[PDB]
Amino acid sequence: MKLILTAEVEHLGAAGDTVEVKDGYGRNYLLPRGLAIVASRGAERQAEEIRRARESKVIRDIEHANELKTALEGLGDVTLSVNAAGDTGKLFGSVTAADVVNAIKKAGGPNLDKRTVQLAKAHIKSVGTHPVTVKLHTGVEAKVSLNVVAQ
Amino acid sequence: SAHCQVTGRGPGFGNSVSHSHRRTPRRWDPNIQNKTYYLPSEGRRIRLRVSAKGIKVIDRDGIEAVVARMRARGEKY
RNA sequence: GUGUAAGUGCACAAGGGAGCUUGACUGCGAGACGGACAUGUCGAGCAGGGACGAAAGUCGGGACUAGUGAUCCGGCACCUCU
RNA sequence: CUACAACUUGGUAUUGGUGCUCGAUACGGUUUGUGUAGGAUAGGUGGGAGACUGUGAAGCUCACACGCCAGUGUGGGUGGAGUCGUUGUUGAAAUACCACUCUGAUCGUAUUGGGCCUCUAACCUCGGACCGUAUAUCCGGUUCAGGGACAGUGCCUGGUGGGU
RNA sequence: CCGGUGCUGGAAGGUUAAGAGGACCCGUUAACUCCCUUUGGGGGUGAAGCGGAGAAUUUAAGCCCCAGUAAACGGCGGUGGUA
RNA sequence: ACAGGCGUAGUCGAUGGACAACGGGUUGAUAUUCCCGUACCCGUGUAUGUGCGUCCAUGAUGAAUCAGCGGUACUAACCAUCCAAAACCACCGUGACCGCACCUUUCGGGGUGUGGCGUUGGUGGGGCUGCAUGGGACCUUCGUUGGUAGUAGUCAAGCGAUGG
RNA sequence: UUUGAAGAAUGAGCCUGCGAGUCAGGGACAUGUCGCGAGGUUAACCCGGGUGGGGUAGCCGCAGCGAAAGCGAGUCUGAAUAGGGCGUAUCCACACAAGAGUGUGUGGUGUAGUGGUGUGUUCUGGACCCGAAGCGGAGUGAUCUACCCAUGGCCAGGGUGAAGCGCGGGUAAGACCGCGUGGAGGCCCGAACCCACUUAGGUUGAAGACUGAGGGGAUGAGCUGUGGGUAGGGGUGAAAGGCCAA
RNA sequence: GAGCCCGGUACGUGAAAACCCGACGUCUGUCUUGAUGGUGUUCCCGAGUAGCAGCGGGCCCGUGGAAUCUGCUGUGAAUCUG
RNA sequence: GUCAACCGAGCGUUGAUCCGAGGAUGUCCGAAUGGGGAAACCCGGCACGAGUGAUGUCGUGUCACCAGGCGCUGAAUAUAUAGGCGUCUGGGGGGAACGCGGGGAAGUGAAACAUCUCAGUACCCGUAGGAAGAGAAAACAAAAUGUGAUUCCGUGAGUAGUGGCGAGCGAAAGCGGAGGAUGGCUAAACCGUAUGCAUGUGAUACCGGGUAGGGGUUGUGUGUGCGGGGUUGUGGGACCUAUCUU
């Protein structure tokens, strides 16, 4: 399995490397963790490796970082870009978690995980202003104040 | 069997042998297994009945692709 | 006595002995026997190329009859067939 | 007699990581070429007129060892300019520098493999707990705990086989 | 009574499938060197490649082999002479 | 392979469990079934009245605090223990090692007891730094009570499980 | 049908009716007949109210020998015209050679097959007709009988008198002994009931496996009822190769 | 035993409604913003597939020298000098 | 109506009886479908309506199962999912043969028999249709300057061949014919697109050059769904780039 590493591993090398390894290793251990990527294309593999490396470096957190993000979760109003019909007051399409987290990227700063976003508690597809909360800690969770771009 | 799911590599029915024949089949099964996988899209673990061949197909083709191809066939996965 | 059972024959020797020696060949074969059929048996004579012999002539295994097994399927050498 | 079920053996896909040990393959410096003339195991071989030394050498005792035990090269260290130039003998010359590199024994580097001690992430759990579930010794899902690349299944293969 | 057959155990050996290997050869031919009448036909070497049947070697169980086992199937003899 | 095989929820299934009627008379034929008489078990209406509690509120409970007495006790830090960081003195068969007289083929190699730094090495005790332990408290504080705050709320006609 | 049957070898009660060499196919071979004649004939199909017209793709003949290349009234083998094999419709007339059996070269006479149909035999198909035991596939069946499950019921009557318990003797205490109670038992005699040992009868039966008189068990490894389950190379079997709808 | 009795035939007639054929006009698209040819090189021409090996089926073909077509496993390529 | 008469009572020129096409009603079982069930018979729910002094009763409807689409929720558990609730459309079974894909015997013949044959037949399964399936060359052929989708019929051919070279099986090419549509539609390179998982030259790039505001038609990636372009064999096509430019 020709794949491009993302992190450092025993007897393979370091991040960014290119290795031909055993198929099951790459099948079961690395590739389903987001720790590697198939080598199918030059620029496709290059871009994926670069972006995945940046995101893996930037995704980390600790318990105390959660205790601090529990305070920093009361950010300013992070707005969301929308294409919908304002005719009746219903939205065409549901809006991603990437969109919310990239809005936080370009307004507040923290580039969080789409996973922990309680978007279900947002209940998008009703035109208004949805609240939000996120599994920051085991026990501690803080809240964000939000608004929507009228369509 | 429960039948394959990604390709449709069903059985076959052989027959005779060497050392004088005797006429007599022996199904040539396919090699299905019970490997599981993970759908990052919908956040879920799926178990399938897939041959090693089909695993090959997956790892050089994706899983989303495969479930869409199976949705076509409307297998009750 | 005849290599080996028995018979028919062998002294005119097919018995015994000595010298050369490879016909213990190739290509054929008139006419005949015996014959359910397939098998089986002899066969003069012609040609090349030889043995022996001075020559005539004899030699296509053994004095004769037994000593072995069809067809199919494969194997080895040679062919100016495909 | 021939064959089949069932059982069983091994190879292979599922099916991987590190460590050790035992093989041969190739990139690599290496041990090592007893024919008399005679320092004489004369590495055969193509340029070929100095020979590497001094970015520290003879003869050397000793760390070493083979051994065709006459002999062979190797290193702490003195030594501080020593054997040597066709040394001359020859099919053939140094064993001077340089080198395509073979009959060799050793050993680094990619490997190709196996066996053994293990980790877990595939896989298995009629082990537990919770949920779907109000009822469910079913089934599924999450999780804990455990086993573990073994087992199970598929394909090829050898064997026993009146069980049929 | 452990020889015969079977069961259990243990491999120092011998035979031992598949698979991994792929030496050496045989087909084909890019390219040459002679033969000949001439309007190139017939001979030899014949690179790599593609193919053919392929050995050497490494190969487990089993079998042969070594012991145990009969409230396991099973088996248990004769002649002669002397008071 | 497909046909189909099993099977949980559940649903059917008495040969059993629970559940309210006995005697006499009658026709040409039925009879605990109709008739005569006396009884019983479900439900359902109308009305009668004895006690009824919701509204009134009649009695009877808790929340839980600001906090006071003494005490788990990040704990600033305290009462007793050893071992070994660097380690202190005494001594003992010392890798190379500096080296009394002699065995020893007549000698280049095979050594010994005392002798000296080193102390790859060995035993003993004492100023000893790191160590955690049980005991008593201080911060946090958890245990015992005065106001309170059984005040606003709360239980009290009934039927009451498809649950125990 | 038998060497041989009036045959005491088989078959037939009698009548009436029914009941066994057939058809397909350009099939094969042989032979009659008809058309054509070195030629013969079409198939599918198209057109046709009909049985008729067309349709040249094909087949059979017209030259064979040889494994084959290949050659050709010759060819194959072989070194060979040197013999032979096969073939050259056959006869006829003249020659030359031998009478080892006749051959060889000329001349003329000139070659007859094919398509319909009929008959006989024949090939493939059930192939003159009737007749098995038994093989395979898919299903039906445990209401009889074999066994198991779930739930109820039945076993008159009379005897024997285990364990235990009590009293008494005995004991140092026991063990032990006697009297009583208790009333167990794959216990006993005997009806119902379940079986079926002997024997007689029946034996074109009352009966497609019974009756009469006797007999075994008869509180248990019981008999039975209602409902249910196991199904064919499979079930079930206190096991006989027994039972699974006479 | 019927041409001339009857029923009916040869022949010609007949459908308010439903059904089927086409026929139309609706309705629907669809090319119209276009084409013929030129010219030198990069890119594409249907991937777990075709191919090869191991067991097998069926093809005139019974594993045979055995193509083409194929089923299960295992391995596994290129895009037109393919 | 009739076997099938008898009796009684009636209708009909105002057009009956009779025939044809469409409608209505259409008890109960049956795929059977509210639940259940020994088939045609037992019990119910919900909305409405009729009815009783109230209950009982009665009538009209509707309620199964799965597959898909849409809608609400997203349990363990965070994303979120399986699942749950509502609505909408389908399927469900029967059939005489005919078809396609799959499975798949045996008696028979071989004078035995296993390979073979009987036969890939019978039978079984899954799905169809009025017909099915196949079908446009990764084909045949042999140097002929050939053919040109497929299928079904005739012949080739009982041949070449295959085969315990035994029984027996057995083509195709080619040729003549029926019918003709020598038929069409897509993917990919390449653009324009909505996007969706990612990131940030955070800039000399997103476009027709150029005169240029911005300061990103997101800057660059990558698959997804839509739209263009493209459908070939003597190769074509998309980029490119001239020419006439209906």
From Swiss-Prot, chain A:
It comes from the Bacteria. PROSITE patterns: RIBOSOMAL_L9. Keywords: Ribonucleoprotein, Ribosomal protein, RNA-binding, rRNA-binding. Binds 2-aminothiazole antibiotics, which are antitubercular agents. InterPro entries: Ribosomal_bL9 (IPR000244), Ribosomal_bL9/RNase_H1_N (IPR009027), Ribosomal_bL9_bac/chp (IPR020594), Ribosomal_bL9_C (IPR020069), Ribosomal_bL9_C_sf (IPR036791), Ribosomal_bL9_N (IPR020070), Ribosomal_bL9_N_sf (IPR036935). SUPFAM superfamilies: L9 N-domain-like (SSF55658), Ribosomal protein L9 C-domain (SSF55653). This is Large ribosomal subunit protein bL9. NCBIfam families: L9 (TIGR00158). Belongs to the bacterial ribosomal protein bL9 family. One of its GO terms (molecular function) is rRNA binding. The keyword Metal-binding does not apply. One of its GO terms (biological process) is translation. One of its GO terms (cellular component) is ribosome. The gene is rplI. Binds to the 23S rRNA. Signal peptide: none annotated.
